[PDB]
């Protein structure tokens, strides 16, 4: 049985939405024609911790081959979008780099780096800003909770 996978959209409290620039994927207030600019995922539920109410997830690019993963950069834990290999993934057991763990309070969503624990994914207050990962979800005005909406 191939792992479970399901596409969806996903958007912060915010209501920003995502897309690629530059190769960076990035939160922003798409309108008019850029609107078609929004990028859905491929969420697929992989293995990872035993856990009471965490769900281990990975999040690709729908029908781009890249996945959002988590690497030290500069010594700080930091998203990035890599390339994968179609022919071999997504699978049940992806490496670490690419897990998330999905939590839902209230029907919000927070995804915490399974490799660095405490890091959440996030997106900037400002627009059209690369979205990144914090440890301070509390500080600031950075935004860590999201929305989804399954499709197909």
């Given at each position: 049985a191939?792992?479970r996978?399901?596409?969806?959209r996903?958007?912060d409290?915010?209501?920003?939405?995502?897309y690629l620039?530059?190769?960076q994927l990035?939160?922003?207030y798409?309108?008019?024609?850029?609107?078609?600019?929004?990028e859905?995922?491929?969420?697929s539920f992989?293995?990872?911790?035993?856990?009471n109410?965490?769900?281990?997830?990975?999040?690709g690019?729908?029908?781009?081959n890249?996945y959002?993963?988590?690497?030290?950069?500069?010594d700080?834990?930091?998203?990035?979008?890599?390339?994968?290999?179609p022919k071999n993934?997504?699978?049940?057991?992806m490496?670490?780099?690419?897990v998330f763990?999905?939590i839902e309070?209230?029907?919000?969503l927070?995804?915490?780096?399974?490799?660095?624990?405490?890091?959440?994914?996030c997106?900037?207050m400002?627009?059209?800003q690369?979205?990144?990962?914090?440890?301070m979800?509390?500080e600031?005005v950075?935004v860590?909770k999201?929305?989804?909406?399954?499709?197909?």
């Amino acid at each position: 049985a191939p792992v479970r996978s399901l596409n969806c959209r996903i958007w912060d409290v915010n209501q920003k939405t995502f897309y690629l620039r530059n190769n960076q994927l990035v939160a922003g207030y798409l309108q008019g024609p850029n609107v078609n600019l929004e990028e859905k995922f491929s969420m697929s539920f992989v293995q990872g911790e035993e856990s009471n109410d965490k769900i281990p997830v990975a999040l690709g690019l729908k029908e781009k081959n890249l996945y959002l993963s988590c690497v030290l950069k500069d010594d700080k834990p930091t998203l990035q979008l890599e390339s994968v290999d179609p022919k071999n993934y997504p699978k049940k057991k992806m490496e670490k780099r690419f897990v998330f763990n999905k939590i839902e309070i209230n029907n919000k969503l927070e995804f915490e780096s399974a490799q660095f624990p405490n890091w959440f994914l996030c997106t900037a207050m400002e627009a059209d800003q690369p979205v990144s990962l914090t440890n301070m979800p509390d500080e600031g005005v950075m935004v860590t909770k999201f929305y989804m909406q399954f499709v197909s």
